[PDB]
């Protein structure tokens, strides 16, 4: 008897009375307000304990925002014999759910934005509290994240490959911040890159100083130090990435 009357969910048991209280309907938990019989949605207080329901009234388990920030709405019996879905004390530690990472502070709220934990700087997405992954622009600075940690190196963004550099490489950049790096080679950890006028690493076939190079489309690293098959054709590249004339 689930019907959406005026944008509000009620459940009639087949009774002039719409159900109230905790209801499990088709393996999903709902709470119908005892005054109005409406299915709770969003952050909800029930008997002085805190729960979270999605817009359909389905009780959620995980990390969701209430008026005091992101709380861990935990499986039953995670802390202090909590009932299923109830927000719990969870202090000064990481939380791992599925493939997501959170960090919880002294207030049992998940960190959002930039935070330092054991001398490492992390970024957790303000919208979800989930560890940042992939390319990100924050306060006009470009970063490339993995598991909440800014990565250092050359990675593909929406405008091509950027140099996400160690701190203080250019214009007092922050660790992992993309930097201006124009019309120059970058030699980084046994790999070679060439950066054009827009500070992006070039890819594919290039002629630089009269020498030919091929920069791998997936990494922007020069083919170097051996024979490489490119588009069904074997070429030979010097240790410096310079292509030797001929086919092999």
């Amino acid at each position, epitope marked *: 008897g689930m019907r959406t009357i005026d944008g509000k969910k009620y459940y009639f048991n087949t009774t002039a009375e719409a159900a109230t209280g905790w209801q499990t309907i088709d393996g999903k938990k709902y709470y119908f307000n005892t005054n109005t019989s409406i299915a709770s949605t969003g952050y909800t207080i029930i008997n002085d304990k805190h729960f979270y329901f999605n817009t359909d009234g389905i009780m959620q*388990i995980g990390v969701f925002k209430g008026p005091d920030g992101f709380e861990y709405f935990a499986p039953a*019996n995670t802390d202090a014999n909590n009932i299923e879905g109830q927000a719990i004390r969870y202090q000064n*530690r990481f939380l791992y759910l599925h493939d997501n990472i959170y960090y919880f502070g002294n207030n049992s709220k998940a960190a959002t934005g930039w935070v330092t934990i054991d001398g490492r700087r992390y970024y957790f997405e303000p919208n979800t509290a989930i560890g940042a992954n992939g390319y990100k622009i924050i306060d006009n600075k470009n970063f490339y994240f993995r598991n909440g940690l800014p990565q250092i190196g050359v990675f593909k963004g929406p405008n091509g490959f950027e140099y996400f550099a160690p701190a203080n490489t250019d214009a007092n950049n922050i660790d992992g911040q993309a930097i201006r790096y124009q019309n120059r080679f970058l030699h980084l950890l046994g790999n070679i890159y060439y950066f054009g006028n827009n500070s992006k690493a070039v890819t594919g076939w290039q002629t630089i100083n009269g020498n030919m190079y091929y920069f791998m489309p997936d990494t922007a690293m020069a083919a170097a130090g051996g024979l490489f098959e490119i588009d069904g054709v074997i070429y030979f590249f010097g240790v410096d990435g310079v292509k030797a004339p001929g086919i092999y």
Partner: nanobody
Amino acid sequence: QVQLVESGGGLAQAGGSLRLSCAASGRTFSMDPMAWFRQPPGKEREFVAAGSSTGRTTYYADSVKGRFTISRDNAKNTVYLQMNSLKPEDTAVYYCAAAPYGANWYRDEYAYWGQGTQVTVSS
């Protein structure tokens, strides 16, 4: 109330294989990473393997890398350690653990620990 119970341990011979199970009860672990540690004779407990609930993130200690694989059955609240190419040096008390709270899963910072089970690899 919460308990992790290892089973499937005991004797095996070098080059052979064994699968350990760890069944969790008292709460659902279907979102939590689960892991294995081992305490070799006369040595400190050490990390073996850990993995997320989806299996998409897994780590292995250098000593078991390419011989042991971790897997789960979430409906059964259970984690497995498939041990292949067993060596005498794999002899140890094997512990499962769940819901790590440290900066990485190699660190022995886990909300829940099993009872440990003996694995003895001979010859």
